[PDB]
Design a protein around this nucleic acid. Structure first.
Ligand SMILES: NC[C@@H]1O[C@H](O[C@H]2[C@@H](O)[C@H](O[C@@H]3[C@@H](O)[C@H](N)C[C@H](N)[C@H]3O[C@H]3O[C@H](CO)[C@@H](O)[C@H](O)[C@H]3N)O[C@@H]2CO)[C@H](N)[C@@H](O)[C@@H]1O
Ligand SMILES: [Mg+2]
Ligand SMILES: [Mg+2]
Ligand SMILES: [Mg+2]
Ligand SMILES: [Mg+2]
Ligand SMILES: [Mg+2]
Ligand SMILES: [Mg+2]
Length: 60
RNA sequence: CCCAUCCAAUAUCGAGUAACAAUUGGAGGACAAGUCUGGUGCCAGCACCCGCGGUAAUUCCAGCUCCAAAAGCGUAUAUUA
RNA sequence: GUUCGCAAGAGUGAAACUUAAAGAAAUUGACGGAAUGGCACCACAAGACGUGGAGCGUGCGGUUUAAUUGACCAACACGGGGAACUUUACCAGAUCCGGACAGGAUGAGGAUUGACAGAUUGAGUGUUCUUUCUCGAUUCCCUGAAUGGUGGUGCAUGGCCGCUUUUGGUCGGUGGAGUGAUUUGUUUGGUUGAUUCCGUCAACGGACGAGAUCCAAGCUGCCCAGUAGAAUUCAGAAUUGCC
RNA sequence: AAUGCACAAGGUGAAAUUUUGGGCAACAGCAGGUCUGUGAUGCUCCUCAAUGUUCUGGGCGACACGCGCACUACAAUGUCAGUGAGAACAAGAAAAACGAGUCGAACCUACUUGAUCAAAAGAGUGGGGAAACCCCGGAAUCACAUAGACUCACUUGGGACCGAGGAUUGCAAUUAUUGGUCGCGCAACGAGGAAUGUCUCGUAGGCGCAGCUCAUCAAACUGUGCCGAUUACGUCCC
RNA sequence: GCGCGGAUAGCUCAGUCGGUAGAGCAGGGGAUUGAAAAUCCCCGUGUCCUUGGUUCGAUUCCGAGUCCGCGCACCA
RNA sequence: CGCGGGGUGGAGCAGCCUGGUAGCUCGUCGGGCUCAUAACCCGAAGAUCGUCGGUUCAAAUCCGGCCCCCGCAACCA
RNA sequence: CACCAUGUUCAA
């Protein structure tokens, strides 16, 4: 009765996925991450999980 | 009036898209000249005669391009060959 | 209109209008409820075994249906068509691009690909809406196009098939005949399934088809076999009679 | 017959007149069929909610009816239940995949089993690349002094229709895929009107069997064998 | 003049004696054809004079009244 | 109106048992023959006997009342 | 010598 939309992928506006605080980086620390990977399924290296009500996400 | 003569005889206006612009009938045959493109689909129309047109029209309605005569060229009725 | 006639009629004799041929003689063909000679169990004869009647299978028509997707002797168990899905061409929906490549505007500060859970849905189908991560130039958005179609037209075609036709038929060359289309060769006679042969012959020389070649079956030679078979001779076993 | 080309009858022979049976077949043509065979094709239509292409579900198969073509019968020259003898053509498994450049499994099959108890199955174990295994290919008609049941009836003829278990093919069986079991059989049908088809000897007819379609399904078709006649060997009547 | 009678699609026309409408052609589209004609299917469709008395409602009943036909008349 | 005749399958007509899915010709259907149609051949269907009553075991017939159709007459001053 | 009638319009 009504035509569907034929979805295009949404732009994330200058961030696909993101890190943590204290961008000074005075030789003490690497920056922390904001999600996890749960590896070997399938890659786990740069695979970062979704929030989705803090649940999960690929796949892995 | 026209035509003719003239743009100095000391001394006369003027072409450019020379826009100051050719048309009238045709392109199957007789009969000179398109197996071009678009439209219509035995309709609309053409065709003196033969014939064209029934969804790929050498013939209709048009655009292009050609042919013929040309300040002319079609058509009709008489009339001679 | 007039002159003849007892009358039927006769003689004389137009036009308006209409039409693109009507005719004439020949040729080639097709056709005859026209002669003549042949042939064929897709003809009959003399017969066989059936179909048409019945029940079912299957194809065709019609009627239904959302839809029930060529052909009318030479269509109808045929399109190798005995389709549950697929096939598939039809109907109700749903995806995907398999719209290459160009040109123009977004574009890495992201063009875009894909998807878990829910809602949507016929669908534990991300198709889409919410959600956020992945993909990392492959794409996407416009414009121009192109490639796909078991879309149409077999009356635009190629190819193949069927059918004219199970018939013996067609064609040149050069000569003859006629203004010519066209004839002759290619024939009246016998003959064969056969323009097959013999003879005749204004024809003579050729080409194809027919025959030949090819396959299969029947008899047969050579070759041949621990992928075919046979006999024998010793051993082993079985019957062994009075019924 | 009258030269010739040849013909009939008989011989010879395995075979006697195209030996038999097929294949192949000229020239012209049909406005035959095929655009549903092709990456055969011109033109023209559709071309992103597409007439493309894929899913999902239907349909092609739906039945007052009319027709082609088969199949099964209407029975005693038979149906049944036994038992015997005994054919030919034929088919048969796999990929640059998944497994252990070599080998396996997909295909057909015998044999055992299932079996101190129905078929249909389901399982083992062999073999076969096919003249080598199936296979001494145990086809069905037929046969039988079978001292077998029926005895002329819509009947033990016929098996349409459909009811209930069950098991296999498939990813899926409902508008039963197919087999098997017990019911139903009171469904016509007793040899078929007008009409009509094919056929001249290993033929017609009967009989089955392979292959092909095929995961599952032959009343089909292409082949093959088996049993095996009636009539004509004529004519132009249609 | 009186009486008998008939009006329903663009036209033509059948009606259950007093419960609501039939076709067909003409029309618009398909199937068919080489295009047509025929042919078949599907579609637009008739407030029935005017109305009253109103059977649950007048087309179907009866009587009034446009329409258009038919039976029958000074007196010797 | 008097009087007289008839209503029968879609058409035209018959019908003497008081009675045959009532009969006839044509038509309508279904199949054949034909390339196709007609002719022709083989089949099958179709009747509120106009209607209501009554006689009867039984009615198209028999007796009626009605509705129609069709005439014969409808006289002499 | 029984009966044996007919096949729409253009076009190819
Ligand atoms: N290519 C052979 C052709 O045979 C034709 O002739 C054939 C016909 O005369 C005739 O054929 C007939 C046929 O007409 C008819 N319609 C059916 C008949 N069965 C045939 O018969 C022929 O074939 C069968 C083989 O099955 C045999 O019974 C018979 O011996 C044979 N004469 O027999 C000949 C076949 O041998 C023509 N001569 C010719 O078209 C051609 O040569
Ligand atoms: Mg044109
Ligand atoms: Mg022009
Ligand atoms: Mg059908
Ligand atoms: Mg010459
Ligand atoms: Mg009969
Ligand atoms: Mg006539």
């Amino acid at each position: 009765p009504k035509k569907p939309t034929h979805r295009h992928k949404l732009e994330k506006m200058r961030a696909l996925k993101y890190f943590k605080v204290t961008e000074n980086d005075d030789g003490s620390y690497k920056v922390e991450r904001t999600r996890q990977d749960c590896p070997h399924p399938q890659c786990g290296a740069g695979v970062y999980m979704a929030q989705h009500k803090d649940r999960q996400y690929h796949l892995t």
